[PDB]
């Protein structure tokens, strides 16, 4: 089906928001994620059923729409910000606590703490010299931000999102991640164990989602590996010999711009890319613990519940064997000539 | 290495107890199980280390050495006895409670309850008419046995075996299985979750044991299948395409005769065959719950502990998925392109 559809027209006859040439080329088909008003009952139905939807008029982060580098540098305060650096467009996430389990893992991206003004300078320096280096700032908002940013944060639409939280029975807000990336940056496919309202502020991002029932096509790393929850498949060069069912994957996609909010349901794979030649992108996300597991488990199980079972089996085995490295060999022994 | 070794000579110059032609031919090599006196400290060391050993002079079932069909029929009472019938020499065990999980399983042997005199008659009838049918009586001894059998049972060497139980920290005696089989009968390879003193009374049995670390060569059925704990491999015609590591199996074997006692340690595979043209065989076994799991688990784990982990993973998955049939598919999804 159609991907992100015919690009939308910006108000005031300012032209297409983007064009087809700013999207990367991939081997799988996609269908559109619906774009709806928050007052549309169809939108409530999709969130209730833990399916993705783009909400166009929440005003969730309305005061942040004026944000840019100059404003943020002046007001975001003098705290440290985590900035990842890579020699490729792909910024693969890795859990630094798990790197002891796997000594042979060498991450491609590197995390350096720095002040926001040092981050602006680096971008400025790279642009000036035409360097191929790439940066991606990913920092959770905290009490150290300046007074202007506090006022902006206070002005978010807490009325609307607090109502969502209550209606869905979610846990509490765990964090807001500030994401500032360069044109063309890619966060490879992965799933998160929390509910996410993804609030776009500056520039455009193409978001490709896959439902939890496509676990078998996306080949996550082992739970103890640093890249737990990330797909092993290289979307730019898929190894069909190792990952044959990636030939059957089908996604849902959309392009979000300033003012849009994308509901990424817990456990849904998402691949996120800042449009080529689109300038810098700014996103703030909202993460909520999922609702509690119901006391009366209902069969048949949902896909995400089976994912959770597999994660726990892997976790338990690592603890019982005393070493994560032995998990694979034991699982193989368990199924070979018995279940396969 | 040598199998059961050069056959032993019966006292009084009564000739070899058996000869090589009464043993079935198999594709794997074997080494001998040691034959020792119960007063030999090497025997105590083997039992302590949960390794098999044949004890030649325990007198464990001394009063039962006079047992034969005529004596048993006269004195074993009028209780029911479980008698399995098969059109082959292989009597594969199946758990009748688990047959609901697997509707497509049709056992080769059949269980019929009957009185001991009806069992003798059937054997007599089969022999008289030269029929190819085979019978194997397997019944646990209970309070219904006649007064003579009680006196015999009371005369077992409880002093010796109770000391073993205490020295090894085992649980209590769970049962004694009376086994009466025809020449050539085979109980295919399987492991039991209890400690076993295997007391031979009449005739000769060839016992082939495999340590728990050969799990990967012996391919047990799934834990929810009726033949849980039995090897899927047909020893008479091994399918090396399905069971490739059966080409690496190596066993320990011995031939036990009247008065011998074989320690079969918990979790050790054993294949047991009544010698061809050897007449009927009579065995009584003693089963004891294993010692409790130590509170401080010690790494590295032993092979049998890894077996227990695999069993529990399978059991838990069946319960959490609500159906044993889904265990295989989920395990496959878990490892394919991830751990294999």
């Amino acid at each position: 089906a159609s991907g992100s559809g015919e690009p939308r027209e910006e108000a005031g006859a300012l032209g297409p928001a983007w064009d087809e040439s700013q999207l990367r080329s991939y081997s799988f088909p996609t269908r559109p994620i619906p774009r709806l008003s928050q007052s549309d009952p169809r939108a409530e139905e999709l969130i209730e059923n833990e399916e993705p939807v783009v909400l166009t008029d929440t005003n969730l982060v309305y005061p942040a729409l004026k944000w840019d580098l100059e404003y943020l540098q002046e007001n975001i305060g003098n705290g440290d910000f985590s900035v990842y650096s890579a020699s490729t467009h792909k910024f693969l996430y890795y859990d630094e606590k798990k790197m002891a389990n796997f000594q042979n893992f060498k991450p491609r991206s590197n995390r350096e703490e720095m002040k926001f003004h040092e981050f602006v300078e680096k971008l400025q320096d790279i642009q000036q010299r035409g360097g191929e280096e790439r940066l991606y700032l990913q920092q959770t908002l905290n009490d150290t931000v300046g007074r202007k940013i506090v006022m902006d944060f206070l002005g978010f639409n807490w009325n609307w999102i607090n109502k969502q939280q209550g209606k869905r029975g979610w846990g509490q807000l765990t964090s807001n991640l500030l994401l500032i990336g360069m044109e063309g940056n890619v966060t490879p496919a992965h799933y998160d164990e929390q509910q996410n309202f993804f609030a776009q502020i500056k520039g455009y991002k193409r978001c490709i989602l896959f439902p939890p029932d496509q676990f078998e096509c996306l080949y996550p790393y082992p739970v103890h590996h640093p890249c737990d929850r990330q797909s092993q498949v290289d979307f730019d060069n898929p190894d069909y010999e190792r990952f044959p069912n990636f030939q059957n994957v089908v996604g849902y996609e959309t392009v979000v711009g300033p003012g849009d909010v994308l509901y990424i349901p817990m456990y849904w794979w998402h691949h996120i890319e800042s449009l080529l030649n689109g300038g810098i992108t700014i996103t703030v996300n909202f993460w909520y613990k999922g609702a509690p597991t119901p006391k009366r488990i209902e069969y048949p199980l949902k896909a995400h519940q089976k994912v959770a079972i597999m994660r726990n089996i892997e976790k338990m085995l690592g603890e019982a064997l005393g070493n994560p490295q032995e998990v694979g060999p034991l699982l193989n022994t368990m199924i070979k000539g018995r279940y396969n | 290495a040598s199998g059961s070794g050069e056959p032993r000579e019966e006292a009084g110059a009564l000739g070899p107890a058996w000869d090589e032609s009464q043993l079935r031919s198999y594709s794997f090599p074997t080494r001998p199980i040691p034959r020792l006196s119960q007063s030999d400290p090497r025997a105590e060391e083997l039992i302590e280390n949960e390794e098999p050993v044949v004890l030649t002079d325990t007198n464990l079932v001394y009063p039962a050495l006079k047992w034969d069909l005529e004596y048993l029929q006269e004195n074993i009472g009028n209780g029911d006895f479980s008698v399995y019938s098969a059109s082959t020499h292989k009597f594969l065990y199946y758990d009748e409670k688990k047959m609901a999980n697997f509707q497509n399983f049709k056992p080769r042997s059949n269980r019929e309850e009957m009185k001991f005199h009806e069992f003798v008659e059937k054997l007599q009838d089969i022999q008289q008419r030269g029929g190819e049918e085979r019978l194997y009586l397997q019944q646990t001894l209970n309070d219904t046995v006649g007064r003579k059998i009680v006196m015999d049972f009371l005369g077992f060497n409880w002093n010796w075996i109770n000391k073993q139980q205490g020295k090894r920290g085992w649980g209590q005696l769970t049962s004694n299985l009376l086994l009466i089989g025809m020449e050539g009968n085979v109980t295919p390879a399987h492991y039991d979750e209890q400690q076993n003193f295997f007391a031979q009374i009449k005739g000769y049995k060839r016992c082939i044991l495999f340590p728990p670390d050969q799990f990967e060569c012996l391919y047990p059925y799934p834990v929810h299948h009726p033949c849980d704990r039995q090897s899927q491999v047909d020893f008479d015609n091994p399918d090396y395409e399905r069971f490739p590591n059966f080409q690496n199996v190596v066993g320990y074997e011995t031939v036990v005769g009247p008065g011998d006692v074989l320690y079969i340690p918990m979790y050790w595979w054993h294949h047991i065959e009544s010698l061809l043209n050897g007449g009927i065989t009579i065995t009584v076994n003693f089963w004891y719950k294993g010692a409790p799991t130590p509170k401080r688990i010690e790494y590295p784990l032993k092979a049998h502990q890894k077996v227990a982990i695999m069993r529990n993973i399978e059991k838990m998955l069946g319960e959490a998925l609500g159906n044993p049939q889904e265990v295989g598919p989920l395990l496959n999804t878990m490892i394919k392109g991830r751990y294999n």
């Binding site: 985590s82 996430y93 859990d95 630094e96 995390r111 990913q138 959770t140 765990t174 964090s175 991640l177 966060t187 992965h190 998160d192 164990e193 929390q194 737990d228 929850r229 817990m266 993460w287 613990k289 999922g290 597991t293 006391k295 488990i297 199980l301 995400h304 519940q305 959770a308 079972i309 994660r311 726990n312 089996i313 | 838990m316 998955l317 319960e319 959490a320």
Partner: peptide
């Protein structure tokens, strides 16, 4: 059964 299905809370944030 309830223990196995219990979800976690891990996200891409260092």
């Amino acid at each position: 059964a309830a223990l196995l299905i219990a979800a976690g809370a891990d996200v891409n944030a260092h």
